[PDB]
Design a protein around this ligand. Structure first.
Ligand SMILES: *C(=O)CCCCCCCCCCC
Ligand SMILES: *C(=O)CCCCCCCCCCC
Ligand SMILES: [N+]
Ligand SMILES: [N+]
Lengths: 405, 405
């Protein structure tokens, strides 16, 4: 069937506002985590986050941004970058039935949902709410707010699956190409960063709380003293394109998506079963006879989570254990946007020939003994890479990307 | 490619707590709209809604329902009905890599998102929020809360696209079957009903506010006196199964999905372009050698919306127009759940050989001239039916179902 390749990327993350800034952070093992007065003032125990260091004011037309929440803003800016990177002119992708968009977020916009309810209960009522809250708060905000302004005529919707969200978005885009329904599909996602959403995770005890005095050390995937993930926000977008279409226009191809896995645990609501992740990676590797040179793990820096994922990896590769690094140690967990951002970090490593380090590992967890966890930037000619994404509800996604000759 | 058929269904709506109660309401054109003190007390102008008349207390195990919001509860109950109606037992669909689930909501759970923020801002903070808000408020709540307890091992995620949400879920389920990845996929969704969410729509001026005195007459699609839609809540789920697999086990086949359209307007954020709907219907009708006997339009009962769709239908068919009926006239708009519930109403019409009436039409709009708008329960031998779903962000979905030869 049809082959799908990535021809453009765009990103807004805690470690960079474009692929060049991100590339530098990855090579340097630079943390994007900072102290958050907002989280502290909200009454939370976790006072750290991976924030987007950028004032988006005026970067989007006023009549367009008025309908958008932060998740959509981040994704929108990421898409602008991706379009430019793919060298797609307006006439090439706009008002085109064969060009679609699949992108979503993990929780839409808790900030604007709370805003609406707060305003509604005030002395102004409906007048304080305004007519823009629906498009900002709805779950499909990210796809709706991008498809409309970019004149998308093809597929248009969001896939939501907690922390696997943007990973499934990319996989679904590949499916549209494989079904011969689209030639190009912009895929990715965005996620806002706010106490309104973060406090819910803290109430679960899922966020780090013992490293507030040293923000850059809070996210420490695989470290014996890890205590939860560091919440983050941002966006990402990639251009998924049918191979022949890309070659014809002389597009720059980063890699082909040669494997896409998507499974379900059918076990616990907030804890990974591991068994589901094993099937997910095996599904993505079906027909992939090249070895995995690098694996960007979910590695959220959680006690149970990091362990379960390492076990799954061992079951899948056994003796063929590939190099591994958890970029979340420096970026934080962007939830719905993690999938696409991590695929982008993986594509950058593949494009530039290097493996980003898994930082903050002062004492490697005992259950990670026989493994190749890269803890220092290492130059190497990579050919095939894998990136895993897991979310609550036992949802699993795995993407495998490979360079083209 | 593989063919997909519907072998079971389940539903919880404002006009019935199962397919029997629903069938009864559709035949008599009974309204599910009632006066809402909650909406009135919130300060809204719209005081009516399509509420689910059911005491869900104790219908779901304590350990399970504790992670669920109303959207998930409605979808869960609908799935139970669908499983039974499909004649499936645990040994056949549980822990089975070839059985998945794709169900979503339009806005996760504004109520629990507001609850979390309100609780957090209280004197107890995190302790008041509790550890169950994330799974209730996240966008993928509907898929996560069902795939886990039902022990689903295949695909698992939600597709959100505003009022087209559950329609894209069904279509995506069909694609999974066509790709040979799944033998069965439970598809549908759910939506809670609360002022927290409703007020956002009222603030847009999209909700009916002139018929609070006569609730059952508020939703009046195609009536020259319509003034917005009536918001509703509920759930729906259908069992999408590969043809040979269904025939092999002697399942009851309602119909085959012979058409699935999904397009984008790339025009206005909240107003339909009509141009996108035209392409969506044609895409779904492509390859269908039989004419459309009935069309369950979107018909939200809005001034511009109703007119735009009629123009689109007029453009697609023209003189040879199929029977048209807007069931939202009696059910209200269940948003994210609208797609699957309407697909079900259509399957019930196809299964029982009849057309549900478009009630509350005191004065047909001038825009509906050359169109066959059925306003009275009519017995007809339908063979092929079509259902349209449109949502903000210019997202379109069309499903065409037909009796199996
Ligand atoms: C990742 O799997 C952990 C869950 C992330 C879900 C997306 C964020 C939803 C927040 C909704 C408000 C609490
Ligand atoms: C249909 O397209 C109208 C918009 C429906 C959006 C989904 C329902 C939830 C909206 C956001 C609530 C916070
Ligand atoms: N990853
Ligand atoms: N419909």
């Amino acid at each position: 069937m049809k082959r799908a390749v990535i021809t453009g990327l765009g990103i807004v993350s805690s470690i960079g506002n474009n692929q060049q800034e991100v590339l530098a952070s990855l090579r340097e093992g630079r943390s994007g985590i900072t102290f958050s007065q907002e989280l502290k003032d909200s009454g939370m125990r976790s006072h750290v986050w991976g924030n987007v260091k950028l004032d988006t004011t005026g970067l989007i037309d006023r009549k367009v941004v008025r309908f958008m929440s932060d998740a959509s803003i981040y994704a929108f800016l990421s898409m602008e970058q991706a379009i430019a990177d793919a060298g797609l002119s307006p006439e090439a992708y706009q008002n085109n039935p064969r060009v679609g968009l699949i992108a979503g977020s993990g929780g839409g916009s808790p900030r604007f949902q709370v805003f609406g309810a707060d305003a509604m209960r005030g002395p102004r009522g409906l007048k304080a709410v305004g007519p823009y809250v629906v498009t900002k708060a709805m779950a499909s905000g990210v796809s709706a707010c991008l498809a409309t302004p970019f004149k998308i005529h093809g597929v248009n919707y969001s896939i939501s699956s907690a922390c696997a969200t943007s990973a499934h978005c990319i996989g679904n885009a590949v499916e549209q190409i494989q079904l011969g329904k689209q030639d190009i599909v912009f895929a990715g996602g965005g996620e806002e960063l706010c106490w309104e959403m973060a406090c819910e995770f803290d109430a679960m005890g899922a966020l780090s709380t013992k490293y507030n005095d040293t923000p850059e050390k809070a996210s420490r995937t695989y470290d014996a003293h890890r205590d939860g993930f560091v919440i983050a926000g941002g966006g990402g977008m990639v251009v998924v394109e049918e191979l022949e279409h890309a070659l014809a226009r002389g597009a720059h191809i980063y890699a082909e998506i040669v494997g896409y896995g998507a499974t379900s645990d059918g076990a616990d609501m907030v804890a990974p079963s591991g068994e589901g992740a094993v099937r997910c990676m095996k599904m993505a590797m079906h027909g992939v006879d090249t070895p995995i040179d690098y694996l960007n793990s979910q590695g959220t820096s959680t006690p149970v989570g990091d362990v379960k994922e390492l076990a799954a990896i061992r079951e899948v590769f056994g003796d063929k254990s590939p190099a591994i690094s958890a970029t979340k140690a420096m970026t934080g967990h962007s939830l719905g946007a993690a999938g696409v951002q991590e695929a982008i970090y993986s594509l950058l490593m593949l494009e530039h020939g290097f493996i980003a380090p898994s930082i903050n590992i002062e004492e490697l967890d005992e259950q990670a003994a026989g493994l190749n966890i890269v803890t220092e930037t290492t130059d190497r000619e990579l050919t095939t890479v894998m990136s895993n994404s897991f979310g609550f509800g036992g949802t699993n996604a795995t993407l495998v990307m490979r360079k083209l000759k």
